[PDB]
Nucleic acid binder design. Sequence first.
RNA 1: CUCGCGGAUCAGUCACCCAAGCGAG
Length: 155
Amino acid sequence: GSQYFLKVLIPSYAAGSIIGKGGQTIVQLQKETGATIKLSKSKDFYPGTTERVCLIQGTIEALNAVHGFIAEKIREMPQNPDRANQVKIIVPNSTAGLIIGKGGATVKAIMEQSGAWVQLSQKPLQNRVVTVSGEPEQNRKAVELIIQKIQEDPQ
RNA sequence: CUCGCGGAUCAGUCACCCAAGCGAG
Ligand SMILES: [K+]
Ligand SMILES: [Mg+2]
Ligand SMILES: [Mg+2]
């Protein structure tokens, strides 16, 4: 199948639930989806964050499926707040360009399409961070549109 | 070169990748 990349950010508390004991959960997920998934090592954060990186390679549908499973795990946290309803994605600068559009018309449309709140990082690597927030179903739809833009691009 | 075994150290619900050492083409 036509393969695409999706890079998503993983809060440290969420990583163990993703990989699983012995790696059983991340292996089973790769098996079920066909996607290849690799995490950064534990203290290997994305510049400017406390978050590990998840590189996923697969069909569009696998990308979407794998993301949702990450979001489900992220939704479960309670160590003893805003981050439980966030998604963060790392996109190439050219696809961020496409996510934004002329005078920001595409991101407005993406937010109007979803019920999600979508931001990007300004211009501080040739990647930008896309932050999506809203309820689960809003975020999912937003993430679907974003993967659609990842798909629509000669990178 | 590449692959197979292996699994130092890191990690730690921590996999994949990656060291020593070994094997094969
Ligand atoms: K190996
Ligand atoms: Mg091995
Ligand atoms: Mg090896």
